[PDB]
C-alpha cells in the first residue's frame, strides 16, 4: 500500500532499499548522472558482495522522490541509459525518450519508479547502465531530490564456494 | 549440358545470395535472451519524443495578458524545420514514402493554481493556416483546459505528404498565481508505413 | 512494411575498405564504422548480432590475388612473404584480377552479440612473382538481430 | 558436372528470360481497377473510325 | 492471334540509350520515349503499367563498368567519384567490358500506372584507375497492362 | 420517361443537372471543348465543395441538345477525351472515335447522352477528361446547342471532418 519494507529498510511511496544523498535541485542546476552498480560500491553489504565475488548479475528498482508543496513548478526527466561513486555526477535530450524513462511533473506527481532488468551481452559479468535525472522545465517557486535504489534478483558465482574434493 | 545466358558473372549489390562459409564446422558463440529485441523499425518510431519547437529549445514559452493570440504554429513537413532532429524525422530521413497517421501530444509544466483555455487547431494540407481565434475554432480543433487536464493527445490523420498546419491559440489569458512552459511530443500511430529506403 | 525489418534495413552490400597494392600487401582491421552511412545505421542499436558476407572486386591498371581472412586473436602479416600467408588455419581465397571473390564469415564475437568489437582482419597480396591493383571489399550483414534501440547521433 | 554447348553467353533480343530483381523486397504501388483495360489489340481495331475519302 | 496481346506487342527488347565514356561518366533520365518506334507504340494507350528488364552491352575501342540504378527521388552523380557511387541504397552492378549485365526493376511509379513518368535514372562509369567504351542499354517491358486506348499520333 | 428530375433541377429528353450557356452553331463555326470538373468551378454548390475539399472523386452524365426543326442538315460529333472555365473553348478527327463518342445527325436525332465514370491512375485526386463537340457535316438551313452536365456518384475526403480527439 504505502510502506514497502525490505530487510531492515522501509520506504514510503504511492535485497534492501539504499537511499542515496539528497540532491538540492536549484533553479540554476543542470542535472545528475549515476552509474550502476558503481553508485553502490561503498553501500554496506552490497559493497561487501561486490568486492567478494568476481562475476555477478542483478536487476534494480529505482525510486526518485522530490518532497515539495503543490505550489512549485518545473519538470524532471528520469531515464536509465545502458552503455564517480555514490555521489554520482553533478552535470540530444529530445531523443532520450527511446530509453525506459518517466517524467516527474510537480504539478501532478512527485515520485517516479523504474524497474531495470539485467541488460548485458554476456549472462554474468564482473561488477552496465546509468540513471540520469534532467531538469527539463526549470524550477520556479530549490527542492531536495531523494533517490532510493533497491537491487533485486541478485545472483553470484560458484567460485569462493566450490570444493576441490 | 547447359548454355550460359546474358547477365552471368554480374555483380549486383542488391542480389541476396547464399554462400560458402570461410570457417566451416565452427560453432559460433550461442544466442542468449537479451531484452528489447527489435525485429522492425516500425516499433521504435512509435515512441513519443520531444519536438524542438522553440534545454530551452524544447520548451514552448507561455506569457500572461494574451487573449485571441497564438502560442505556436507549425507546418507538418517531417523532413525539415522543427521535426528534422526528432527520432521520427531521423528515421523518416532513411525512406522516401511514409504514408501514415501521427500522434502529437502536449504537456503543461506550470503551478497547480494556474489555469488557462487553449484552442489547438489543425488545418489539413492544401488549405491556409488560421489567422484569428475565430477562424481556428471554425476549423478542426480541441478546446484544451490546462486547469483540469495537464496532458493532451491529438492524432493527426494519415497524410502521405511526399503537409498542413497545427497551431495553438490563447482563448483566455494564462492566469498565474501571485513564464511557464509547454512540452510537445511526436510519434506515429500503429498504421504508419514506410517504403523505398534511401541514403 | 517489408523495408523496415532489420533483415532488410541492415542487410545490404556496402563498400567498407578500398586499397591499392603493387607487384606489396595491405592488411585491414575489420571496422564496419569506416563508412559513415553504415555507422549511422549501426549506432541506432546498443547490441547487434549478424553473420558476415564479403564480396571482393580486384581491378588492374598499368594476375592472382590472395584474400586471407585472419580470425579474432590470430596474428596479421608484417611482410607480403611471412609464414602467416602459408598457415593452414587462416582461410584464404585465390582468384584472378578483374574477376570477383565472395564468401561468408559466421558470428566470431566473444559475447552473444557485438557492443557498439574485433571481427578479425583481411590481408591482401598479389600472388605472382617479379601493375597497380585496387582491391575493394563489400560487406553484407546476414540473419541480423538487434537489441536495446539507442537514440541517433546528432553532432 | 556439365559441359557448355554452342550459343552460350549469346545476346538474343527476342529471348524472353526471367531475372534477378534490382530492388528486392520492395513492395510496388498496388494495382487499382482502372476501366477499359486492353489485353489484346484485336479489341481496338474493331472500333469504327472515319475514312478520309475526299 | 498471339502477336496482338499486349504481353507480346510491347514486351520486346529495344535500345533506349547509347553513350560513350573515357578512362568520365554518363547519367541518363529514364525516358522510353527516346526511341520514336517505342514512343509510337506507347502513345497508343493513356495509362500503362509494366515491370522493367534492362540488358547492358559494353564494348571497347582504342576493364570493369559500374551500372548504377538511381531510384525515383534519389540524387544523380555530378562527378565520377561522388559519394552516390559508394551509397548502399542505389543498387549498382559490376561487370567486365565486352561482356553484358542484365537485371530487372519493378514498377516504381507513384500512381497505379504511368500517364503518357519519372522511372529513375541510370548512371555509368568505368571502375579502373588511370580507351573509349560505348555503353548500350536495352529495355524490355514485362507483365504489361494498359488502359484507355488513345488515337495514334498523325503529325 | 421524358422529365428526369434531380434535386431542384428538371430536364427533358427522349447531384443535379447543370445547364451551361447555349452555344450558337453558325455555318462557319469550328467546334467547342470543355474540361471537367473545370467547367463546373463557378457552378453553385458543386463549386463550393470543389473549393472546400482538397481530394475528390465523381462520375458525370452529359446531355448535348440542339433545338431545331426537321429541315436543318449537318452532323455533330460528341466525344469525351481523357487527358477556360464554364464558357469552355470556342475552337486527326477521323481517329477520335476510339474514345466513347456519339454522333448527332439532325436528320434523325437532336440529343446525345454520355455517362463518364471516374477515369484516373489514383483512386482520389485534387479537383481529368474533356467533352468536345465538333461539327463534321456543316450546318445547312445557325442553331443553339445546350449542354447539361449532371455530376453523379460524387465522393469526398475525410479531412474537414476527422476529429483530433
Curated annotation (Swiss-Prot), chains A, F:
Assembly and oligomerization: Interacts with capsid protein VP1 and capsid protein VP3 in the mature capsid.
Compartment(s): Virion; Host cytoplasm
Domain of life: Viruses
Task of the protein: Forms an icosahedral capsid of pseudo T=3 symmetry with capsid proteins VP2 and VP3. The capsid is 300 Angstroms in diameter, composed of 60 copies of each capsid protein and enclosing the viral positive strand RNA genome.
Identification of the protein by name: Capsid protein VP2
Amino acid at each position: 500500500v504505502q510502506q514497502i519494507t525490505l530487510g531492515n529498510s522501509t520506504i514510503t511511496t504511492q535485497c534492501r532499499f539504499y537511499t542515496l544523498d539528497s540532491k538540492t535541485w536549484t533553479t540554476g542546476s543542470k542535472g545528475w548522472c549515476w552509474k550502476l552498480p558503481d553508485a553502490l560500491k561503498d553501500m554496506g553489504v552490497f559493497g561487501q558482495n561486490m568486492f567478494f565475488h568476481s562475476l555477478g548479475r542483478s536487476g534494480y528498482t529505482v525510486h526518485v522522490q522530490c518532497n515539495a508543496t503543490k505550489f512549485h513548478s518545473g519538470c524532471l526527466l528520469v531515464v536509465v541509459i545502458p552503455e564517480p561513486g555514490e555521489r554520482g555526477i553533478d552535470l540530444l535530450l529530445g531523443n532520450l525518450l527511446i530509453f525506459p524513462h518517466q517524467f516527474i511533473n510537480l504539478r501532478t506527481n512527485n515520485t517516479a519508479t523504474i524497474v531495470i532488468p539485467y541488460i548485458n551481452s554476456v549472462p554474468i559479468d564482473s561488477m552496465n547502465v546509468s540513471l540520469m535525472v534532467i531538469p527539463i522545465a526549470p524550477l520556479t517557486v530549490s527542492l531536495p531530490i531523494t533517490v532510493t535504489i533497491a537491487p533485486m534478483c541478485t545472483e553470484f558465482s560458484g567460485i569462493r564456494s566450490k570444493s576441490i574434493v | 549440358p547447359t548454355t550460359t545466358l546474358p547477365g552471368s558473372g554480374q555483380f549486383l549489390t542488391t542480389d541476396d545470395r547464399q554462400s560458402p562459409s570461410a570457417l566451416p564446422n565452427y560453432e559460433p558463440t550461442p544466442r542468449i535472451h537479451i531484452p528489447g529485441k527489435v525485429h522492425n523499425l516500425l516499433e521504435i518510431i512509435q515512441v513519443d519524443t520531444l519536438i524542438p519547437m522553440n534545454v530551452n529549445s524544447y520548451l514552448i514559452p507561455l506569457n500572461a495578458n494574451r487573449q485571441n493570440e497564438q502560442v505556436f504554429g507549425t507546418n507538418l513537413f517531417i523532413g525539415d524545420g522543427v521535426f528534422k532532429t526528432t527520432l521520427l524525422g531521423e528515421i523518416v530521413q532513411y525512406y522516401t514514402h511514409w504514408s501514415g497517421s501521427l500522434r502529437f501530444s502536449l504537456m503543461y509544466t506550470g503551478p497547480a493554481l494556474s489555469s488557462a483555455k487553449l484552442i489547438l487547431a489543425y488545418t489539413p494540407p492544401g488549405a491556409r493556416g488560421p489567422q484569428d481565434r475565430r477562424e481556428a475554432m471554425l476549423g478542426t480543433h480541441v478546446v484544451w483546459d490546462i486547469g483540469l487536464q495537464s496532458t493532451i493527445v491529438m492524432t493527426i490523420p494519415w497524410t502521405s505528404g511526399v503537409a498542413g498546419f497545427l497551431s495553438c491559440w490563447y482563448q483566455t489569458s494564462l492566469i498565474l498565481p501571485p513564464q511557464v512552459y509547454l512540452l510537445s511530443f511526436i510519434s506515429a500511430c500503429p498504421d504508419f508505413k514506410l517504403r523505398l529506403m534511401k541514403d | 512494411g517489408s523495408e523496415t525489418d532489420v533483415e532488410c534495413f541492415l542487410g545490404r552490400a556496402a563498400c567498407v575498405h578500398v586499397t591499392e597494392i603493387q607487384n606489396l600487401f595491405n592488411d585491414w582491421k575489420i571496422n564496419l564504422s569506416s563508412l559513415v552511412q553504415l555507422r549511422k545505421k549501426l549506432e541506432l542499436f546498443t547490441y547487434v548480432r549478424f553473420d558476415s558476407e564479403y564480396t571482393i572486386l580486384a581491378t588492374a591498371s598499368q594476375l592472382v590475388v590472395q584474400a586471407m581472412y585472419v580470425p579474432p586473436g590470430a596474428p596479421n602479416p608484417k611482410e607480403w612473404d611471412d609464414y602467416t600467408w602459408q598457415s593452414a588455419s587462416n582461410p584464404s581465397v585465390f582468384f584472378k584480377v578483374g574477376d570477383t571473390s565472395r564468401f561468408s564469415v559466421p558470428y566470431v564475437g566473444l559475447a552473444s552479440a557485438y557492443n557498439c568489437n574485433h571481427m578479425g582482419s583481411m590481408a591482401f597480396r598479389i600472388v605472382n612473382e617479379h601493375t597497380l591493383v585496387k582491391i575493394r571489399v563489400y560487406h553484407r550483414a546476414k540473419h541480423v538481430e538487434a537489441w536495446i534501440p539507442r537514440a541517433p547521433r546528432a553532432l
